[PDB]
């Protein structure tokens, strides 16, 4: 539910002026939420659209506050301010009692009423002191209750009357539609039930409530002693019993088919507005007797419910170590009167304003809210339950899936090779100065460890030369390089290499592969030190005029790309042009 409250009214009830930030923090602490701030002038101005501007109402701000769906006492400023001020330990929690009265009102229920609306309850508020704001709040509370818990007035209906304008023991009849006739509220001439239905058929506000009892053979009605129709629930009240600002006594009644929700609604209404009485927090009872059964009941109930919880269970469920007295004091901040009986056992008394406490777990949530959910010491799971991957392997796997999606076949080669493959066939005479040499090979093929992935791809192309063109192989693996700063003098660098073998091996075909690989790594082609680019370069292993150097983010050299030299092609047995690319993938980590 959403409640709109004037800012000045909030200041009056709280007792101090809150800024927006303070009120937002207070809402975050308790569980509410400040939806919007809009002056009532602006609220009317933009309620139906900013074009329909209405500035005839108050210019004071109004806060829209969201209320938990199971909280009923927070539907008006009277209950909201009381709850918050008790939470901050400003005021003492009120106590609700019954006022002694030698003359009680009486309601007599007829048998036929068992056909449509069989249940009715009532209460009386005495010596009221309503003013301009309290009356509007009183109407708004009834509107909210009818819209949320009463289920659009289908289950429970509420009526309020002036106790002085009517007199006598009330009767709850179910006469025929043609047997009832009276003057409706805000109407001049009298009408009967059928005339009333015809009149309200074309209405808008009361249109939806008609089908509730429209088809029943009889209609509910309430009469006083002197044959005056007090109300015809759940449609409208009587004009003769209208309540205004001059009223000093209010009679509240509820007609329902569900007995429990009537209790809840009556208790909420009678507790929220019992402070305005000349004797604060005091109500007098009403007796209701059923003619069919002859039983008698008294209302309202004002039920204080006693529960018995155990401290160890609460601590285990929440994850705390609070003692008995600490938990009792903590619960005392949530409108609950908690008392310690013995060790580990706690007796709690829930007041009538809290009708959402069914099990002990509700009390546990109360003790967790009072303590604060941000003061709980967490306990992480053990290390041998969570599995952490090696980041470069995860990135390589995800990238390899996309490489396969692009249409490139994966290959696999040996780590060891000969000196001629990485030095002479690649036209790099100095390449041997960076490689790792093997002392005791058993063949003339395992002399050095590879420094580039190109020879493996070229030899694999040579083996499968007879397959239909084009051949598009790739491989991302480690290479071994000599580094003096390392512990052992060498290190492994993860590199991705790819080739494109066909009768035409234009630079564009492999440049597009490079661009797609960069796109999948979320790096844009920009020259502003945040993206990658390429520029001309000279290298013996690439054909002149078709070699480029790849510069990544922060001006970091990444690798090379271009068409291979004809001598490099012929040194591996191939006979067709091939494009190649190879670059490091560790900077992207």
């Amino acid at each position: 539910p959403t409640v709109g409250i004037k800012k000045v009214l909030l200041d009056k009830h709280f007792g101090r002026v809150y800024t927006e930030k303070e009120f937002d923090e207070l809402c975050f602490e308790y569980g509410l939420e400040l939806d919007e701030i809009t002056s009532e002038k602006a609220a009317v101005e933009k309620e139906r659209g900013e074009a329909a501007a209405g500035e005839d109402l108050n210019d004071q701000e109004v806060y829209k506050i969201d209320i938990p769906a199971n909280r009923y006492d927070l539907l008006s400023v009277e209950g909201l301010s009381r709850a918050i001020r008790i939470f901050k330990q400003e005021i003492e929690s009120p106590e609700y009692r019954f006022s002694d009265t030698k003359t009680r009102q009486k309601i007599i229920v007829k048998r036929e009423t068992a056909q449509v609306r069989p249940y009715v309850v009532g209460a009386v508020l005495r010596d009221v002191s309503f003013d301009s704001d309290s009356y509007a709040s009183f109407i708004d509370l009834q509107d909210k209750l009818h819209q949320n818990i009463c289920r659009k007035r289908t289950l429970v209906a509420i009526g309020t009357h002036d106790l002085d304008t009517i007199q006598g023991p009330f009767e709850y009849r179910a006469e025929a539609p043609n047997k009832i006739k009276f003057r409706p509220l805000n109407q001049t001439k009298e009408y009967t039930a059928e005339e009333l239905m015809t009149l309200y058929s074309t209405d808008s506000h009361l249109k939806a409530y008609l089908p509730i009892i429209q088809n029943h053979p009889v209609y509910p009605v309430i009469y006083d002693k002197n044959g005056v129709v007090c109300s015809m629930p759940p449609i409208i009240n009587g004009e003769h019993s209208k309540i205004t600002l001059k009223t000093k006594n209010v009679f509240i009644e509820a007609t329902a088919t569900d007995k429990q929700k009537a209790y809840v609604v009556l208790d909420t209404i009678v507790t929220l507005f019992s402070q305005y009485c000349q004797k604060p927090f005091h109500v007098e009872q009403v007796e209701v007797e059923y003619e069919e059964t002859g039983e008698k009941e008294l209302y309202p109930l004002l039920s204080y419910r006693e529960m018995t919880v155990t401290t160890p269970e609460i601590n285990t469920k929440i994850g705390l170590s609070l003692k008995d007295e600490e938990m009792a004091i903590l619960l005392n901040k949530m409108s609950l009167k908690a008392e310690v009986a013995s060790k580990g056992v706690l007796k709690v008394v829930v007041p009538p304003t809290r009708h959402d406490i069914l099990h002990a777990c509700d009390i546990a949530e109360d003790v967790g809210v009072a303590y604060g959910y941000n003061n709980l010491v967490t306990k992480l799971p053990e290390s041998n339950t969570v599995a952490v991957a090696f980041p470069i392997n995860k990135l390589c796997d995800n990238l390899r899936i996309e490489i396969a999606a692009a249409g490139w076949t994966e290959a696999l080669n040996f780590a060891l090779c000969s000196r001629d493959d990485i030095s002479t066939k690649l036209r790099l005479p100095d390449a041997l100065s960076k490689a790792v040499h093997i002392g005791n090979p058993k063949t003339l093929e395992f002399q050095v460890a590879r420094t580039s992935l190109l020879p493996g791809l070229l030899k694999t192309l040579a083996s499968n030369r007879d397959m239909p063109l084009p051949l598009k192989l790739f491989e991302l693996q480690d290479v071994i390089l000599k580094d003096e700063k390392m512990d052992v003098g060498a290190r492994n660098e993860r590199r991705l290499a790819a080739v494109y073998y066909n009768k035409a091996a234009g630079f564009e075909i492999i440049q597009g592969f490079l661009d797609r690989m960069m796109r999948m790594l979320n790096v844009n082609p920009t020259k502003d030190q945040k993206g990658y680019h390429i520029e001309a370069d000279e290298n013996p292993t690439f054909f002149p005029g078709r070699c480029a150097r790849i510069i990544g983010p922060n001006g970091v050299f990444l690798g090379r790309i271009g068409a291979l030299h004809p001598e490099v092609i012929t040194s591996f047995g191939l006979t067709l042009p091939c494009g190649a690319v190879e670059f490091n993938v560790e900077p992207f980590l």
Partner: protein
């Protein structure tokens, strides 16, 4: 110009005639030919990442191919009374053909009816008249907690053992044509059941889960949920708007929907959950959800979609 082809012909490679003719200068400021590739869906990639995270934390997947569900498992088994705004027909799809389901476990249904209409197990109930004809109706599921209830009942029947389960699937809610929300959305949920479980353990579990998502500092706010108590809502700081934003929720199930199943009194079942579209929209920078889900999807977003480096 000269014979300045962009490439060398195979004849030139064979005959070695590449050293007598010039070649054309290449513009290195341009871009190459875009390869024709196959693409995945960003939501599916995020779902796969979530599945991998759940597997790495030790969670077993559940069966969630049960879109149509009876009202007994969807609402009544979760201790939602029949006459409350939670079970309204305004936001729930109702099935007309087929309309009812007849076969239920009789003993469990009787215990559920007893707890709803009279109370028990240290509870108070709602003391209203529970009707079987209301539970007969079939609906499209509004949440994945029904599957969790089925799994918990099955586990309780065949003997208890500590368990960790998760589910990621579609749920349906009845909404009018607008832009704030759609009628269907994917919901991610994880459930942990074991003895003497506490709220601090749950806090640690989802703290680790979100730390694997790149989120470090978290705050908690009280909230309300019909079938979990205590419940809370998780907030994380966002620098793009410089404010705290809600990211998920959690809570521990009520004893009134566990004891009738048959679980031991010493077992606490906790759970946490979130959506799937919000993290995807934040990560990939997507404003309108309808550009990603439905028949109005924009394929240019799908084509130019990077890999899911959610830890970044």
């Amino acid at each position: 110009l000269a014979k300045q082809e962009a490439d060398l012909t195979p004849e030139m490679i064979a005959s070695g005639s590449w050293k007598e003719k010039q070649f054309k200068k290449y513009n290195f400021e341009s871009l190459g030919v875009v390869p024709s590739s196959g693409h995945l869906h960003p939501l599916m990639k995020v779902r796969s990442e979530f599945r991998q995270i759940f597997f790495s934390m030790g969670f077993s997947e559940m069966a969630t191919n049960r879109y149509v569900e009876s009202s007994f498992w969807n609402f009544d088994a979760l201790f939602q009374p029949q006459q409350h705004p939670a079970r309204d027909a305004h936001d729930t799809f109702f099935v007309s053909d087929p309309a009812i389901s007849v076969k239920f476990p009789e003993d469990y249904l009787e215990r559920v009816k007893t707890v709803h209409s009279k109370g028990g197990y240290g509870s108070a109930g709602y003391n209203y008249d529970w009707k079987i004809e209301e539970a007969q109706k079939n609906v499209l599921r509004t949440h994945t907690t029904a599957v969790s209830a089925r799994q918990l009942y099955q586990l309780a029947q065949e003997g208890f053992r500590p368990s960790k389960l998760f589910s990621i699937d579609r749920v349906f809610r009845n909404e009018t044509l607008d832009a704030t929300h759609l009628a269907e959305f994917h919901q991610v949920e994880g459930v942990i059941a074991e003895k003497n479980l506490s709220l601090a353990h749950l806090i640690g579990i989802f703290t680790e889960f979100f730390k694997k998502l790149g989120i470090t500092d978290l705050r908690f706010k009280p909230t309300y949920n019909p079938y979990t108590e205590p419940s809370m809502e998780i907030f994380a700081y966002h620098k793009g708007l410089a404010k705290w934003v809600e990211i998920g929720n959690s809570g521990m199930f009520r004893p009134e929907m566990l004891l009738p199943m048959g679980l031991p009194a010493d077992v606490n079942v906790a759970g946490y959950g979130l959506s799937l579209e919000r993290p995807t929209m934040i990560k990939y920078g997507i404003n309108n959800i309808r550009d990603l889900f439905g028949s109005k999807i924009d394929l240019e977003v799908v084509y130019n979609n990077p890999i899911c480096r959610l830890d970044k």
